[PDB]
Amino acid sequence: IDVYIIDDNYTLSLLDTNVYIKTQFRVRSWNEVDPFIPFYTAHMSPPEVRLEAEDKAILVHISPPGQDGNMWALEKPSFSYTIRIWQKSSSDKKTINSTYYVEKIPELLPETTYCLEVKAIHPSLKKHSNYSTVQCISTTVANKMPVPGNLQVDAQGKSYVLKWDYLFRAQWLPGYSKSSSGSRSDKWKPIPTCANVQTTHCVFSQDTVYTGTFFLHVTSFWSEEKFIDSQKHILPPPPVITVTAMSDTLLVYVNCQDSTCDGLNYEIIFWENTSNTKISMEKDGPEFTLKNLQPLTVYCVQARVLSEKLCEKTRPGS
């Protein structure tokens, strides 16, 4: 006889055994089967999903498989989600991938009714979940006041500058909050320096926004969550670029400034001394070969490792 396991449900509350050790069952056919680890035979139930709509957006509140249980109580960070959205009558489904327990689907049409489907995936332990029961929601009519557009955060170390385009309130959320399981989230922390500003220039210090990574918010709905990592990374220094203009091909060599240079990824940024457009390509090794360039013309190359402008004129054609 076989045993079916769907999360913490078994088939033939506060206190439970270890899901990673050797476990057995006895029912009285005189049941006594092969001893097994439940974590390999357990299936993933679809994730719980609740929809919330705005003018041009839909908020998909994903709850991971288990409320909360034990089978997935230590797998929650591993899980990823795939969302499918379409209007009620349509057949073409838009696909959005998310690690976030709340994924706001933007660029939507107001007073239109869209239907959703969320899949829970375990990208490392092979397993996956059957899509959730379809859920439909309708968008509201466009607000008399629109939400802020493009956001950019330029920081001078201990102080942050929030520059954007349009009374304005701002809220901050630590990086791990949007990414880790809800039930206790997402309670957005406030900003006193930017709570009712008159200008688009917003300045806040590291004392208030204490986490290394955080999201920013900008009666109107909420703006796009701008994620910004505050790291004192003044590493590594620029590499040493070498250019060899050959008959036709223009060979470029990137040299890292800390050798051995065995395992490294490189990037190139090339243009012309007359154009204002920059062309960029990345390779595996450092030997970049700029092929099919116009002859007798000056080309400016720049490189980075994962440099300063070095201009070289091509060859005529021997």
């Binding site: 230590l74 990086g175 791990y176 990414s179």
Partner: protein, 160 residues
């Protein structure tokens, strides 16, 4: 592609986490006894790919631990919010540097080693729930996470 660069990042980062863990109050008593120990495979020599996963798994579990009610400790919430974030930052970093490679992680998930590491952390979360998240249980867990971070540091030698 190289593991030597990943070794420099995990060393820089475990220092960032160990400092944050130390700043919870000011006293870590390593003699704080509780029956659960880090699996023997961790102290023992292991594969090059297997180490990066072991680190990730440990940082994922250390994260999950600090999510629990730490109200009884009287620790600074600000520092625990800070710790979970620096922990999660690396968890996200490791998963992305093991994105292009996909075969060896499957072999690692079906390993007896990974199962033993997950069995261990299950026992750590179970311990805290049984002791109803009081100060003594956390005093024991803090001491264990310190010992664990040292194991993360020992494992970084397996990259060179």
């Amino acid at each position: 592609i190289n593991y030597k660069q990943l070794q420099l990042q995990e060393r820089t980062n475990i220092r960032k986490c160990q400092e944050l863990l130390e700043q919870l109050n000011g006293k870590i008593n390593l003699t704080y006894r509780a029956d659960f120990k880090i699996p023997m495979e961790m102290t023992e020599k292991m594969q090059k790919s297997y180490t990066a996963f072991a680190i990730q798994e440990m940082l994922q579990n250390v994260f999950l631990v600090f999510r629990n009610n730490f109200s009884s400790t009287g620790w600074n919430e600000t520092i625990v919010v800070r710790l979970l974030d620096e922990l999660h930052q690396q968890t996200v970093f490791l998963k992305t540097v093991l994105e292009e490679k996909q075969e060896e992680r499957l072999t690692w998930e079906m390993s007896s080693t990974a199962l033993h590491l997950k069995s261990y952390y299950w026992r750590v979360q179970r311990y805290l729930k049984l002791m109803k998240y009081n100060s003594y249980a956390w005093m024991v867990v803090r001491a264990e996470i310190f010992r664990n971070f040292l194991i993360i540091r020992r494992l970084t030698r397996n990259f060179q």
